Amino acid sequence: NSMVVEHPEFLKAGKEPGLQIWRVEKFDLVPVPTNLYGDFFTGDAYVILKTVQLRNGNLQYDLHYWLGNECSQDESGAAAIFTVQLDDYLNGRAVQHREVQGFESATFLGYFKSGLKYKKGGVASGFKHVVPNEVVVQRLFQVKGRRVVRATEVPVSWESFNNGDCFILDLGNNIHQWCGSNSNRYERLKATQVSKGIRDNERSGRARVHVSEEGTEPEAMLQVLGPKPALPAGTEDAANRKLAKLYKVSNGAGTMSVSLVADENPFAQGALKSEDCFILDHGKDGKIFVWKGKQANTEERKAALKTASDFITKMDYPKQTQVSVLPEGGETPLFKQFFKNWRDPDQTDGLGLSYLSSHIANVERVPFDAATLHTSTAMAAQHGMDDDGTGQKQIWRIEGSNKVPVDPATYGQFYGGDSYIILYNYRHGGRQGQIIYNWQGAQSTQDEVAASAILTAQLDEELGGTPVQSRVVQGKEPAHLMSLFGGKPMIIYKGGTSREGGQTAPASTRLFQVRANSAGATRAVEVLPKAGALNSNDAFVLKTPSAAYLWVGTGASEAEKTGAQELLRVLRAQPVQVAEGSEPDGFWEALGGKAAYRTSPRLKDKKMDAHPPRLFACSNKIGRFVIEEVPGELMQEDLATDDVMLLDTWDQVFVWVGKDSQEEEKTEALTSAKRYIETDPANRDRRTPITVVKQGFEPPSFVGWFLGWDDDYWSVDPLDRAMAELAA
Numbered sequence: 001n002s003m004v005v006e007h008p009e010f011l012k013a014g015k016e017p018g019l020q021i022w023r024v025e026k027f028d029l030v031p032v033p034t035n036l037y038g039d040f041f042t043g044d045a046y047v048i049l050k051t052v053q054l055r056n057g058n059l060q061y062d063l064h065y066w067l068g069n070e071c072s073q074d075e076s077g078a079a080a081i082f083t084v085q086l087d088d089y090l091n092g093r094a095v096q097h098r099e100v101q102g103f104e105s106a107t108f109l110g111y112f113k114s115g116l117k118y119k120k121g122g123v124a125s126g127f128k129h130v131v132p133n134e135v136v137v138q139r140l141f142q143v144k145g146r147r148v149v150r151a152t153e154v155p156v157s158w159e160s161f162n163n164g165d166c167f168i169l170d171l172g173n174n175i176h177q178w179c180g181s182n183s184n185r186y187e188r189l190k191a192t193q194v195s196k197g198i199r200d201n202e203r204s205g206r207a208r209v210h211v212s213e214e215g216t217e218p219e220a221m222l223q224v225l226g227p228k229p230a231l232p233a234g235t236e237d238a239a240n241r242k243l244a245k246l247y248k249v250s251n252g253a254g255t256m257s258v259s260l261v262a263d264e265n266p267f268a269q270g271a272l273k274s275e276d277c278f279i280l281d282h283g284k285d286g287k288i289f290v291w292k293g294k295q296a297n298t299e300e301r302k303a304a305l306k307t308a309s310d311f312i313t314k315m316d317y318p319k320q321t322q323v324s325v326l327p328e329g330g331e332t333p334l335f336k337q338f339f340k341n342w343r344d345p346d347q348t349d350g351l352g353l354s355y356l357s358s359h360i361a362n363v364e365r366v367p368f369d370a371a372t373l374h375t376s377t378a379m380a381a382q383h384g385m386d387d388d389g390t391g392q393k394q395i396w397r398i399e400g401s402n403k404v405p406v407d408p409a410t411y412g413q414f415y416g417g418d419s420y421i422i423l424y425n426y427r428h429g430g431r432q433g434q435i436i437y438n439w440q441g442a443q444s445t446q447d448e449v450a451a452s453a454i455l456t457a458q459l460d461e462e463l464g465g466t467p468v469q470s471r472v473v474q475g476k477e478p479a480h481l482m483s484l485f486g487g488k489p490m491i492i493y494k495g496g497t498s499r500e501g502g503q504t505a506p507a508s509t510r511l512f513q514v515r516a517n518s519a520g521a522t523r524a525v526e527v528l529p530k531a532g533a534l535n536s537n538d539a540f541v542l543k544t545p546s547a548a549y550l551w552v553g554t555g556a557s558e559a560e561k562t563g564a565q566e567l568l569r570v571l572r573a574q575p576v577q578v579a580e581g582s583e584p585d586g587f588w589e590a591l592g593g594k595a596a597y598r599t600s601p602r603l604k605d606k607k608m609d610a611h612p613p614r615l616f617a618c619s620n621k622i623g624r625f626v627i628e629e630v631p632g633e634l635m636q637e638d639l640a641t642d643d644v645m646l647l648d649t650w651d652q653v654f655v656w657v658g659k660d661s662q663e664e665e666k667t668e669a670l671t672s673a674k675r676y677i678e679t680d681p682a683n684r685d686r687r688t689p690i691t692v693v694k695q696g697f698e699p700p701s702f703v704g705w706f707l708g709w710d711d712d713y714w715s716v717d718p719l720d721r722a723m724a725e726l727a728a
Contacts, residue, residue, distance in 0.1 A: 003089070007029065009031050017052060017053040017059070019037065019048070020048070021046060021047070022046060022047045023045075023046045024045045024046060024047065033129055035131065035202075037112065038114055038197070040066065041127060042071075042101065042122065043068055043120075043121055043122020044071065045071050045076050046066045047082050047086070048064040048099075048111070049063055049086065050062040050064075050358060052356055054356055055351045055356065055365075056352065062107065063096045063097065064097035064099050065080060065082070065096075065099065067100050067101065068101045069101045080305050080306075083305065084305065092301070092327050093327060093330055094330075095332060096325040097322070097323070098305065100319070102150070103321075104116075104322075105322050105324075109632065116150050117194070118151070119153045120153045131202065131204075135172050137170050138171060138172075138224065139156070140153065140167060140170070141154065141170065141194065142167060143187070143190065143191040143194055145190070146190070147630040147631065149193065151191075161178075161231050162180060162231050162232050163180040163231050163233050166179045168191065168195055170198055173206075173208065174207060174220060175195050175203075175209045177191060177195045177210070178211075178212055178214075179214075180214065181214040185719050186641075186719070189718055195209045199727075208728060237627045240284040241679045241680065242679050242681060243681075244281060244282045244338055246261050246280050246281070247259060247260060247278060247279040248278055249276070249277045249279060249311075253297060256310040268339070269341075269343070273293060274293035275293055276293050277296050282338075282681065285681075286320075286321055287324070289323075289324045305325065331355060336610070337682040341600075342610075352609050353609045359612065359631075359632050363378075363707075365382070365608070366379045366382055368518045373387065374387065374429070375429075377428075377429075377709070378704050380701045381702070382608065384478055384479040384518075384649070385483065386433070386699045386700050386701045387426040387428050389424075389485075390486075391424065391427055394423040395422045395423075397418050397420055397498060398418065398452040400451070401455075403455055404499065412484075412489070413493070413498070414441070414474075414490070414493070415497050415498050416442050416474055416494050416526075417496050418441050418497050419438070419451070420438075420452070421438055422437040423436055423467075429700070433466075433467070434463060434466065435469075435480075435699065436459055436467050438456040438469070438471045438472065439474070439477075440471065440473050442494075442495070456471075457469070468692065468693050469692040470689060470692070471670065471689060475492070476687040477689075478691070479519065482517055482521045482522065483521035485521075488566055489564075490522070491567055494507070494510075494527075509529045509542070509544045509590055509591075510526060511526070511528065511533060512541040513535065514540065514560050515537075515560070516557065516560045520559045522560060523563075524564065524567045531597060535597065536553045536598065537553055537556065538555070539551065539556045539560040539561055539563065539564040541568060541575075542587065542591070543573060548573035548575055549576050549584075550568060551578050552577065554579075554580050613634065613647060614629060615629070615634050615638060615646070616645065617645050619644075619665075620672070634647075635706055636710065639695070640658060641695060642658055644665045644666070644672060649705075651689070652689045653676065653677060653689070653691070655673045655691070655693065656694075656695065659695045669692050670690060670692065677690075695714065696714055
């Protein structure tokens with residue numbers, strides 16, 4: 001028998017986007033009924049194929065296998081086997097995931113946003129997944145977790161209960177949802193999904209969800225559980241993110257040994273040879289990766305999962321540690337970010353990259369258009385532009401502990417010796433909002449940098465606590481800030497001061513980098529006058545006592561050319577146009593010789609593919625900084641009013657502060673972002689802009705990342721809503 005006859009579900013999954021789940025039953029793959037996706041037997045293992053459509057129309061595969069806690073070695077064996085052999089039928093191009101009950105990957109978790117159910121039983125005890133009528137049930141689920149929401153089947157007893165969690169006592173025609181007196185309001189909201197899911201999927205709409213809390217339990221509940229005793233209380237990353245090591249493997253074709261190849265990230269991409277397999281160990285953060293070179297032998301590549309196991313044992317890591325195997329050419333963004341500038345040899349041509357993260361597979365890529373920007377929060381988000389930047393603005397320089405108004409004639413020029421506050425009014429949709437930019441010169445004195453931080457916060461306070469607050473550090477201006485100065489470029493000088501006090505004298509030979517954005521606005525950044533500071537993508541202006549050069553890189557467009565000559569006007573010099581590759585030698589001598597610089601192009605449109613937006617909740621309690629990734633598609637729902645969240649684009653880190661989060665959390669908003677940035681395994685630029693945003697006053701460049709954003713969402717308490725209209 002063929003396999004495509006016999007697993008025709010496999011044919012569809014191989015050919016259509018969607019999700020397919022089989023349960024391993026006596027060394028066979030048996031489809032799980034669709035409306036039960038999310039239900040898992042704790043004594044079994046399963047195989048999960050997610051098929052994503054790529055944008056060029058091609059299909060991309062994530063294979064996961066999932067082991068329950070009461071799984072036999074032989075069950076998990078089969079699951080591993082099918083995983084390897086399925087990847088085989090898909091021409092070695094799938095990404096493989098080992099997933100363990102309780103600690104499955106953020107990717108895995110994202111497939112099930114009604115949540116997971118972990119049921120008692122398995123094949124060995126004669127249990128199946130089966131809907132067809134005839135339902136005499138008596139089950140108890142403990143619902144636990146805030147973003148990751150898991151419902152675990154537990155003994156039908158008050159001993160199973162506690163004050164801090166939610167419980168569902170499934171009784172067939174009637175589902176009883178119960179909430180601990182110490183259960184937080186957001187957790188109850190989540191538990192309602194589970195209940196509703198049991199009503200809709202398992203009881204085909206026809207059953208009553210009855211909801212209650214301690215002291216108000218129904219007769220039905222009291223009848224099966226007995227009279228209620230006193231219950232106990234509840235049981236709910238760090239700086240283990242930063243460090244990772246890379247290893248070469250010898251023998252999956254025999255017995256495991258490994259060599260250290262890099263002891264600190266970021267790693268050199270060239271360390272990854274095709275003839276071999278490598279392990280990237282991030283085990284202290286709960287994850288390891290296996291990378292298969294396209295040239296490693298078959299014995300080797302088909303033994304990847306086994307190799308991962310051995311490594312976890314050899315290093316004495318927890319058994320629930322996550323494992324990912326990746327084929328050469330099919331690396332995931334999280335993998336590639338461990339390396340110095342990942343360049344996949346082709347990829348400026350083509351739509352997309354190595355991998356499309358499942359959680360943005362749906363996002364329609366909208367190009368930049370100033371005239372329709374005011375209509376597209378999608379475009380706002382995708383381009384980091386809250387508006388076209390032509391609205392009213394005030395600019396101050398910090399002198400001592402005061403805001404001093406900058407000369408309106410010089411709006412656009414910023415000195416590295418100073419620190420600035422720009423107050424900006426933006427307009428998008430039909431609604432108005434405010435942004436306060438805090439620009440910190442690389443040479444500004446600590447007293448003044450700090451003064452500008454405090455003054456920023458005080459301006460926000462007195463503008464009613466609502467403006468967006470954005471810290472930017474010299475040389476890393478966010479896209480929107482550049483676009484605030486008519487058609488002129490934002491000019492940034494290495495380090496003088498514009499204050500009345502003390503004008504200085506300009507340096508003898510000065511080099512400026514002129515970089516443009518999606519919107520065509522440019523910024524000219526003064527840099528060290530060395531050839532090693534050159535870039536093929538941008539225009540450059542070099543000023544020497546002798547003359548003035550306007551060097552135009554082969555990547556540079558019209559916008560960069562025109563931006564550069566507007567700067568030449570400011571410097572009061574006369575340009576000498578000079579194309580890259582064929583330059584007068586008076587130029588090369590002005591830079592002190594010719595060394596090598598950067599030629600490889602920038603990601604531009606593919607930035608989103610390489611670095612999809614990721615949402616985290618973060619927390620300080622215990623004097624320990626802890627973060628939790630929220631899995632799957634970014635939803636407004638995921639923004640809990642008693643939380644401080646982080647939306648990480650690549651270019652910026654938004655921190656969202658909920659109205660009901662704690663004081664220390666709200667005032668640590670900035671430091672939290674800095675800590676998230678400091679600890680990232682990618683070695684993020686410490687200058688990365690941070691933008692603090694308030695619940696109910698989010699800007700377009702933020703809301704535009706969540707499809708389904710509704711502005712009245714918070715007017716009625718979220719839990720009060722879900723109570724009535726969603727359930728019964």
